[PDB]
Design brief:
32% helix; alpha+beta; seven-stranded antiparallel β-sheet; Band 4.1-like protein 3; binds 2-bromo-4-fluoro-N,N-dimethylbenzamide; 12 strands
Length: 284
């Protein structure tokens, strides 16, 4: 039995190394990573890899690892795949903990835009979780946390984190993580997977995929939203991605919205992530 070395970037930024038989399906590696993390609520998570176009792809647990990474290195990241609309309903604190780490990366990276005050508040819960109660000793007027809180740090933001941290005295890690999630889950881009596309007129848009449905970001003014109930069918052909929309009551015929993706692979990727979110957030 020939085994391949796999390297997985964990959500705390550490590296986990293991071996799988070279013909292993993605589920085999995923089960090994989840055991290492003591994670039971595995359905929300998945492994990503970077393709030869350098694009993030979900490792399909049902398919051979080798048929997906193809020519690439057996290097992966551990990520949230389905962001729970209501993290309070997850059964385990460790589940909420990994969701927090993913979200901290979403914020720092700028995938999850956040106001000043919400950056500082989220920051303040992370600090309470990780260091416990505010202590002036390791905090002077010039203090700067090791914690990355935002795409761009300012002294004002560091001060606001400390001010809000003072207010959380006695808060346990599980409690701070729950408060973090009750705030994060309300952000307009929470759990939104964005894909670059052009509309049928050739205008640059973003397609968002999330729990509740599809979002078409034309710009800040005029954002189309298709709840899953409204979506009849979605398809891809070549570089094209088409959304079939239900008729309104006493309308005879569905509407079709077509989009142009950068290439055939980007169309197929968007299609797969829509089907997966549609299945998940038709069962939840
Ligand atoms: C193949 N497939 C699952 C579809 O075309 C689809 C249909 C309805 C919907 F709400 C979302 C999707 Br995705």
């Amino acid at each position: 039995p020939k085994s391949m070395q796999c390297k997985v970037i964990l959500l705390d930024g550490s590296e986990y190394t293991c071996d799988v038989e070279k013909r292993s399906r993605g589920q085999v590696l995923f089960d090994k990573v989840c055991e290492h993390l003591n994670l039971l609520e595995k359905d929300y998570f998945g492994l990503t890899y970077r393709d030869a176009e350098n694009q993030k792809n979900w490792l399909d647990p049902a398919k051979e690892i080798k048929k997906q990474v193809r020519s690439g290195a057996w290097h992966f990241s551990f990520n949230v795949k389905f962001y729970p609309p209501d993290p309070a309903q997850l059964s385990e604190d460790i589940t909420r903990y990994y969701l927090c780490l993913q979200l901290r990366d979403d914020i720092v990276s700028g995938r999850l835009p956040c106001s000043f005050v919400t950056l500082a508040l989220l920051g303040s819960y992370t600090v309470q979780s990780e260091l416990g109660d505010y202590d002036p000793d390791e905090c002077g007027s010039d203090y700067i946390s090791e914690f990355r809180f935002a795409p761009n740090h300012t002294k004002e933001l560091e001060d606001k984190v400390i001010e809000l941290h003072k207010s959380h005295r006695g808060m346990t890690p599980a409690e701070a993580e729950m408060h973090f999630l009750e705030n994060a889950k309300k952000l307009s881009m929470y759990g939104v997977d964005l894909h670059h596309a052009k509309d049928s007129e050739g205008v640059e848009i973003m397609l968002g995929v999330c729990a509740s449905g599809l979002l078409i970001y034309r710009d800040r003014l005029r954002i189309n939203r298709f709840a899953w109930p409204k979506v009849l069918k979605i398809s891809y052909k070549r570089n094209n991605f088409y959304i079939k929309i239900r008729p309104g009551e006493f309308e005879q015929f569905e509407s079709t919205i077509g989009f142009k993706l950068p290439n055939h692979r980007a169309a197929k990727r968007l299609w797969k992530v829509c089907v997966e979110h549609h299945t998940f957030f038709r069962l939840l």
